[PDB]
């Protein structure tokens, strides 16, 4: 939408978020990193 309202919005809940998977995520490159 070319006429959406821009910029960064205030009015949010900036108090971390206690609703997320607290477990280890088994989905990452398991290989050594050559970089």
């Amino acid at each position, epitope marked *: 939408d*070319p*006429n959406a309202n821009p910029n960064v919005d205030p009015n949010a809940n900036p108090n971390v978020d206690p609703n997320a998977n607290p477990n280890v995520d088994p989905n990452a490159n398991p290989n050594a990193n050559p970089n």
Partner: antibody, heavy 120, light 112 residues
Framework: VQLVESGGGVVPPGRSLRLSCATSGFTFSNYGMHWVRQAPGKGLEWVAIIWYDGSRNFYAASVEGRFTISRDNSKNTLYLQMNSLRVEDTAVYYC??????????????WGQGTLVTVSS | SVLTQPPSVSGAPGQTVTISCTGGSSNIGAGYDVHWYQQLPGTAPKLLIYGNINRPSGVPDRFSGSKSGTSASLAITGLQAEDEADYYCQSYDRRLSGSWVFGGGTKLTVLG
């Protein structure tokens, strides 16, 4: 809010030229930016907008495909990349900070612009 | 030119003159807020009017706006020589891939 513009000058047609708008007095990363241009003898034509995080890139059809808008939040700088410039692209280019009231956008502050001349 | 504007307006210092802007169902009657800019001759077209009637602290209390349907308007009272400028209205064209549209621009000449 302070907007400073440069990069104008005369360039042969078919060549590129790029402009920049340096900003200060506010957090650059919290606002989107606009480029607009005014050909000598004409009114003001809107050119492009980029959102604060690069998430939106809108162009007037008259400039789309030749003009690219970009920004670098670590430099507080807005850039306009112009490719294959036409004589018709001669204009004072201006940056402005994005703003809106309820239903439409607007510029809430303007830089002074710089002149890009495209000529044989 | 997207928004319709007369090419010219004028009056003597001290007088009230007005600038009109007219649109359609795609850009004024459309519900898009119509704003005004003042292109003083040596600079950028700074914001003059916003919110159809309101204005920046950078604007003399001479200026005010108005909007009803497709009819947008700018009044300049107590006209000064320093008000010579190209005035533009601004809105958003429902069929525009870009974000802003401007009217043709009205040139205000102060007769004194």
């Amino acid at each position: 809010v302070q907007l400073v513009e440069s990069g104008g000058g005369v360039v042969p047609p078919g060549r590129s030229l790029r402009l920049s708008c340096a900003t200060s007095g506010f957090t650059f990363s919290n606002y989107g930016m606009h480029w607009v241009r005014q050909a000598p003898g004409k009114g003001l034509e809107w050119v492009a907008i980029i959102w604060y995080d690069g998430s939106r890139n809108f162009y007037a059809a008259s400039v789309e495909g030749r003009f690219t808008i970009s920004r670098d939040n670590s430099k507080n700088t807005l850039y306009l990349q112009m490719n294959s410039l036409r004589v018709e692209d001669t204009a004072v280019y201006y940056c402005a900070r994005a703003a809106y009231y309820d239903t439409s956008g607007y510029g809430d502050y303007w830089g002074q612009g710089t002149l890009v001349t495209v000529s044989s | 030119s997207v928004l319709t504007q007369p090419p010219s307006v004028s009056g003597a210092p001290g007088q009230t003159v007005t600038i009109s802007c007219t649109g359609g169902s795609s850009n004024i009657g459309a519900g898009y807020d119509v704003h005004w800019y003042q292109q003083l001759p040596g600079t950028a077209p700074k914001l003059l009017i916003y919110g159809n009637i309101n204005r920046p602290s950078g604007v003399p209390d001479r200026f005010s706006g108005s909007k009803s349907g497709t009819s947008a308007s700018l009044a300049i009272t107590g006209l000064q020589a320093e008000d010579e400028a190209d005035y533009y209205c601004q809105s958003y064209d429902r069929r525009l891939s870009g974000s802003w549209v401007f009217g043709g621009g009205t040139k205000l000449t102060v007769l004194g």
